[PDB]
C-alpha cells in the first residue's frame, strides 16, 4: 500500500524528530534570538544563511547540515546574480520546502529534520522579523512569535505561549527561553542572535563569558 | 543517526 | 589610475584615486578604487574598472561564502592563494585587453606582533604575488612616481596619520606627474579614497580629513 | 519493512565491528598516542591523514582503507587549494560523516567500520588535542580523554576511565594503554604518535626496538 | 572479511 | 534476509574453491617455489606479475585469469608511472583485495577464486620473501613460510607444516612439496620459481626435462 | 636569476640568489629560489617566479600525498620521472612564454656509498633530464658564468663548508657578470639563499654564515 | 535460489545442445578434419577462423554464428595490430571462454552451443594439431585426439575411441568418422579440413563430387 | 519458471501467427510467384527487398512492416557499401533470423510474425529460386519448392504438395495456388512475382485486370 | 531455436 | 565453468 | 618509382621496379612494389612507401575478413568500390604530402570470356577509378614514359611471355628516362618484381626469367 | 649523434656514441644511446634525447606487457609493427621538432640459419621500415659518413670482434667529420657504448674493450 | 492486432 | 504539504 508506505515513512520521520534536541527561535527587542541545547562544542545547529538571515534546524546533523550548505550556495548565487538586497528569507524558505518535499517523495529515506528560516529588518529599517518553519513533508509555517523544535514540543510550546513577551530585552528573552526549555547550565548551549542593529551581517553568536555573565 |  | 598601500606601526593604510579616463577623455571623477573585502583586509585593483569591480565583488563573495561554510575565515595565505588563482584565471581576459592589477593590504590577526601585523601583498600579471617587506606598495599608472616619492617619504611614516598624509602626498605626486592619475579636486571637492586597517579591522578615512590633508599639502607645495 | 531493513543493517555493521581488533588513541603530554593490536606487519589500521592529523579505524580493512585514501586526497586538495593551515580535522570528520551516512543510505551493504579523527595543536601553538569518534551510521562523537575502537570496548573503556591521566608521559601512557588493552608482545602491536613538538608533521610511528625498549 |  | 544472501554467496564461493586443484607456494633457499597440479599444457595457474613478483591462484580459470590480466596492467601502469622499483607486492595485494571485495559486494556471483601474492628480494638484496594470500571476500593473509591453495588444503597443509624446511634447497624443497601434494608425475604438473638471484626478472618456470631430472 | 648545486663528499649543497626583475626594472630583491621539497631532496627552479613557485608547491604536495597513500616515499628514479613528467606537461605554457627551468639535487639514502649519495639532476626544456656526474650544475641566466667558474673552483670543494663557499663565490661571479642575477646586498643585508642536504636530511644554511662567506669573498676580490 | 537458478540455466543449456546435430573434428595425417551433419546447404556449422585455425560449433545457429563473427573480427584485429603469425588458436579459445562465461553469468538467456577451436602446425613446420573444446559456461577442454559435440556424444565418442588412429589418412579417417557418426549420404553433411600443407590458409572444404569420390 | 515463461511466449507467437492470414510463395517457370490474400488495398503483405529479392510475411502487419523496412535500409546500405550484386537473400535471411532471435530473447514482447525470404537468379543467369522461411525465434528453414505463411498451413500445404509442379507456368501455378489456398475472389488477394527475366528488378505485381485476365 |  |  | 600493368590473351601481368629514393638520396634498391592482394588480383601502389605498404596490408585484411565473414569473396565491382573508398579516405593525408596512388590488376573469374577475364583498374587521386580498356596501364614517376613505350610495344603482346617482356622493357624505359625509377641492377643482381594473373590466379615471376629478359633487352639495346 | 648497426656471422652488433648538444653547445658527454629492449633486440634512437628515452621506455614496457599477458613474446614482425605504429603516432609531435629516428638491431631466434639470425631494421620518419639486407645501418647526424666509411670497412667484418672494431672506427669517423657526433674522449676516458646480440642474447660490450679498440684505431690513424 |  |  503506497498510502501505508508513506504513513510508515512519515511516522519514522516523526519518531526520529521526536528523539531529537529542542531548538527555540524567538523575536525579541534586538531582533531574533537563537538557543540550542548542544553539548558538543564542535557541532553547531545554529548558523547564518545571509546578511539578515539566520539558520536553525533540529534533527539528524548531516541532513540539515548539507541542506544548510546547499542553501548557502543558492543564497550566495542569488546575491551575486542580482544584488545583495534581492535575497529574502521567503524565497529561501520556498526553496527549502520544495527541496524537502522532493527529498521525502523521491529519496528512499527522508531527512528526519525540522527547519527554521529567520529574516529581520535591514539596517536603519523597521520590519517584524520573519520566522518560517519547514517540515520534511513541506508544511512550511509562518510563526509570528516563536519557533519550537525537537523532543516534546508541547511543554516547551506551552511555556513559551505563557511567557512570550513582545519586544523582550536580551536578558529577559534569554531567561524566559531557558525557563521554557527547562520544561540548564551555560555550557552545552549554542546561542546566536540576528541583530538588525548590525550594519550588514545581523547574525552573531553569544558564547562563553558573554553568555556566562549574560545568563 | 545523530540528533545532537 | 594609481592605488598605493603602506604599513604603519600597528596597522596598514591603503588609498586610491578617483579618476577614470577613456583615452584622453575623462569618464569618471569620483571613482571608488578601494574596496574593503572584509573586516581585516581591503583591496584596491588597478586595470580595467569594470573587471576590477566584478573581481572585487567575486572575491568578497568567495571570502564570505567560505567563512559561512566553514564557520571560520581563511588564513591570510589562503586569501592570497585565491586572489592569485583568479588572477591566473584572468590571463585569457588580460591578453585580449581586459587587464586588472590587484593590490592587497591586510592586518594579520594571527601575527605574533600586532605592531607588524600589517600585510601588503603585490600581485603581478602572471598571477603570482609578493608580500611587501619594504612596508609600502603602489600600483597603477602613476605607481612608479608614487613609489619614487614615498620611498623618500617613508622616513616620515610613524602612525595612521603620518602614513595617511604620506599616501595623500604620494597620490598627489602621481596625479601631478601622470595625466591619467587623478588628484585632489577642490572646485568639485573630490579627493582620493583611502582605508585604514588595524587590530580593530578595516576602517574608511572620513572625507574631511582627506580634504584637509590635501589642502595642507597643497599649501606646502604652493 | 524498511525499518526492519535499516535495523538488520545496523546490527550487521555492529556484528562486523564487534568481531574486530581494538584500537585505542589517548591524549597525553606530548599529544596523541596511537595504540592498536596489529599482528600483520604490512597491514596498518593507524595512519597519517594530515601533518597534525592522524587516522585510526576498526572494521573491514578495505572499507576504511579506501576511506583513509579518500580523506588523504581530500585533505591534499584542501591544502593545495587554499593553504596548509586551512585543513582541519573537524572538516575532515564532517566529510567522513557525510560520506558514511550517504553510503549507508544508498549502498546495499553498510560498512562495518568505526573511525576516529585526531587533531593536535600546531607546532609552537597550544591547543588540547581533539578526538572525533565517527560511527558507521555517520554519527560523530567528540571525546576529550580517550577513544576506543572495535571489539569489547567495555572493559578497556572502563579501565581507561579509571586509569586516564591528563598530560601523561609517553612511557606511563604507554603502559596504562597496554594494561587497558590486555583486559601483549612488542609484535602484534601498532604504535604511532601525533607529536605536537614536530615542526610540521606531528604524526610518527614508534615500532620495534624503540617500541620494545619503551615498554 | 578482514579485521586485524 | 540480506544475511542469507551473503552466506549463500560465501558458501557458493567456498564450494567453488573446494572443487579446485591444489597449488603450493613455498619460501625456499632460492626464493619462492611455485607448484601447481595442472594436467593441461595450455592452461596456466602460475604466472609472473612483476620483475620479482609472481602470480598463483586456483578456482575459476577465467576469473583469476582476468584478475591476473588486470593486475598485470595495474603493475605495468605503476612501474611506468613512477619507476620499476616503485612496484611492490603489498600494493598489488591491496588492489586485488579491494577488487575482490568489490566484486563480492556488487557482482551477481562471487568469484570462486582465492589469490596468492609472492614477492622476493631484489637482485643483490636480502629480504625474506613475502606471501600474501587473498580470499574471495578480500580476507588477505600474510604467510611467512608457505601458501596452501585449493581443494582439501588440510592434509597437504599438515604435511607441509610438518615437513617445512626453511631455506630448503630447490631439489629438497620440490621433493618435500610433491610428497605433501601427493597426500604426481613430472607430467600433469606446473612448476615456476621466483628466483631472487636473477638480475631483473626473478620469475622462471621449471618444466619437462629440467623438472623430470630434478624429480 | 641563477641557481647552482654541487655535490661535496657525503652530501650535496645548492643555492639561489634573491633578485627578480621585470625586464630592466627590478621587482624583488630578497626572493627565495631554492625549495626543500622533502627531507632529502631540494629543488631550485629558474624561470617565471609564480610558475616556479606553483611547481614547487605542486611537486611537494604530490610527493607527500604519494608517500602518505602508499606509506612509502618514492625511489629517486620515480621522483625524477615525476619531475620530468611535469616539465613535459608545461610545454604548452613554455612555448607560450611561461618558462621555468628546474634544478633537483637530492641525497639518495638508498645509495650503496653514502659518501656518493649526493645527487644532481639537470632537466632540459623538453622534459628530459640528466644526472650530473661532474658534481656541479647551475641553472638560470647566470648559469653559464657560474658553471664556468665552478669548473675551476670544484678543485677546492672538500666538504659542506668548501662546497658552500664555492657555490657562494660562483653565484657572486654570476651576479657580477649578469645584471639579471642579484648578488649579496650588503646595505640591505640581503644574501643568496642556500640549502645543505646530507645523510641526516636537507638543512638550510644560517644567514650569518652566508653573509660572512660573501664578505670574505668580497674582501678577497677587493 | 541463485544456485537453483544457475542449475536451471545449466540444464537449459545442456538440453538445448542435446537436441542438436553432432559435429566431430579429428586429428589425421593432413591435420584436422571437420565433419558435421548439415542438411542445409546455406547454413554452415564449420568455418575458418584464421590461416591455420578453423571453427566448429554445435548449438543454436545464430548464437555460435555471432560468436564466430566476433571471433573473426578479433582475430583480424590481432593479426593486423601485431603480425599475421601472432594469432594463435589458444588465445582465440581463451577469449571465447571469457566471453561464454561472461554471457552465461550475465545474460538472462544462456547460449546452448558447444564450440571447438582447432589449430594446426604452420606450413613447413611440424606441431601436433590442437583441439580446444569450450563449454557454454566457458569450461575449456584441450583435446589431443578428437572433439564430439552436439547430440548423443556418448555412442559416437566411444565409436571414435575404439576407431581412433593417429595420423590417419584422409579417406580412412573420413570413413571412420562416417561410421562413428552413423552410430549418412554424401549430401546432408558438411566436410572441411585444416591442411598444414597449405602455404598460408590451412582451412579448406571438401564437398560434392570430391566428397562423393572420397566415399 | 523461465521455461514456462518461454513456453507462454512461444505459444503466444504461435497463436498470433496461426490466427493470421495465409501467404504462399512458390517457385515456378518464371521464378517465384507470391500469392497472399489481401482484402486491404493499403495494407501490403508482399514487397521487394532487392532487385532479385522479394519480401513475404505472416503476422502482425506493423511488426513485419518495420522489419521489412529495416531490412530494406540494410540491403541498400550493403549494396551501396560494396556493390549491388554483392547483396544476397541468404545474408538478409541471416540478419533477419539474428534480429528475430534478439527480439524474442530480450524484447519483452515477442513478434507474432513468420517470414519468407526469396531470391532468384540474376538476369541472363541460371540459378534455382531460393526460399528461406524464418519464424519468430529465428528458426530459419530452407524450402526448395514452396513456403506457406500463417493460417491453417496443413490443408493448403498438402494440396500444394499434391499439386506442385516444378517449372509450372504462371497461369498453371496461379490456378494450383488458388485451388490449394481455397482449402477467394479476385479481390481480397495480392499477387507478386520475382521474374528472373527482369533485367535488374525481378519483383513485379499482378493485380486487377492483369489478375482478372490471368484468371 | 535452430540447432541443425 | 572451469573451477579446477 | 613506376608500376606497369598490361593485359595479355587469357590473363594479366603487372610489375614494379625496386628503387626507393629520398630526394636525390637512394634509400632502397630492392623494393618489392608489387602486392598480391588475393589469388586473382594483384596491386601495385606508387607514392609514399609506408602509406602504400599499410594500404596493401589493410586492403588484404579487409578482403579476407569480408570473405571469411560471408563465406564468399567480393565481386570485382565491390573490390574496386572499396579501394576507391580507402583512396578517398586518404585525401586528407594526401593534401599533406602522404600520397600513395594505386594500380589494380585482376582476373575476373566471373567474366564470360576467360581470354578477356583479366582486368586493369586505374585510380585517380580523388578516389575515382577507371577500368583500362587499352589493355595496359602504368603508374609512378616514369608512368608517362612507360605508357609511351608500351603504347608502341602493345602490338607485340601475345601471351604471358610477350606481355611480361614488354612490361620489363617499359620498366627499363621508365628507369632510363626517369632517375626516380630503378632499372635492372646487374652488379647486385637486382631486377624489378612482377606478378602474372590468369585463370589459375596471381603467381609471382621467378627472378631467373626477369634477369634473363632484362639481360636480353640490354643486349638488344647495347 | 650517430648510431650504427652491422651484422656479423652468427649475430649482430650495434653501438652509439656519448655526446649530446643543444645546437652548438655541448650538453652531455656520457650519453647512453643504445637500449637493450629485450634479450634479443637492442634499440638506438637518434633525434630528441627526451623523446628517445620515452620511446625506449614505452617500447620496452609494451614488449614486456605483451609477453607477460600472452606468456609468449612478440615475433620480430610484430615488434617491428609496434615500432612502426608508435613512430607513425609520433608524426604530429615530430613536425614541431621533437623528432626521434630509431634503429633496431635484433637476433631472430626463429631464423632458419642462426648465422643469418641477426637482423637490422631501418625505420623512416613516416613510420615506414626496412630490414637492412645489405648488412649494416647508421642513423644520426654522422649517419651518412659512418655508412660511407664502414661501407669500405665491411669487407673486414667477420665476427663480433671484427664487426665491433669496424663499428668503433665508423663512429670515430662520424665524430671526426661531424661536430654533432662525439668520439672517444681520452682525457675523461669516455668512449661510445655498444651492444652485441647473438644466439645467447644481447650483451653490452665492456668499456675496457671499447677503449682498447678506440686506442688501437687512434694509433693507426696517428 | 493487424493480422493483415 | 501546505495545502493553504
Structural class of chain A: alpha+beta
The DSSP helix count of chain A reads 6
Relative helix content of chain B: under 10%
For the record, give the distance between the C-alpha atoms at the N and C termini of chain A, rounded to a whole number: 52 Å
Shape of chain B: elongated
In the CATH classification, which architecture of chain A applies?
Answer: 4-Layer Sandwich
Main beta sheet of chain A, described?
5 strands, antiparallel
Strand order of the largest sheet of chain A: 8-1-2-9-10
| Largest interchain contact | A-D, 15 and 16 residues
Strand-pairing-aware structural class of chain B: little secondary structure
- Number of separate domains of chain A: 1
Radius of gyration of chain B: 4 Å
Number of strands of chain B: 0
**Major sheet details of chain B:** none
CATH topology of chain A: the name is Glutamine Phosphoribosylpyrophosphate, subunit 1, domain 1
How much of the polypeptide of chain B forms β-strand, as a percent range? under 5%
Distance between the termini of chain B: 9 Å
The CATH fourth-level homologous superfamily of chain A: Aminohydrolase, N-terminal nucleophile (Ntn) domain
**What sort of overall outline of chain A do the alpha carbons produce when their principal axes are compared?**
globular
Task: Give the strand tally of chain A.
Answer: 10
Number of helices of chain B: 0
PDB class: antimicrobial protein
Keywords: Mpa, proteasome, antimicrobial protein
Entry title: Structure of the Mycobacterium tuberculosis 20S proteasome bound to the ATP-bound Mpa ATPase
Chains A, D, F, H, I: Proteasome subunit alpha
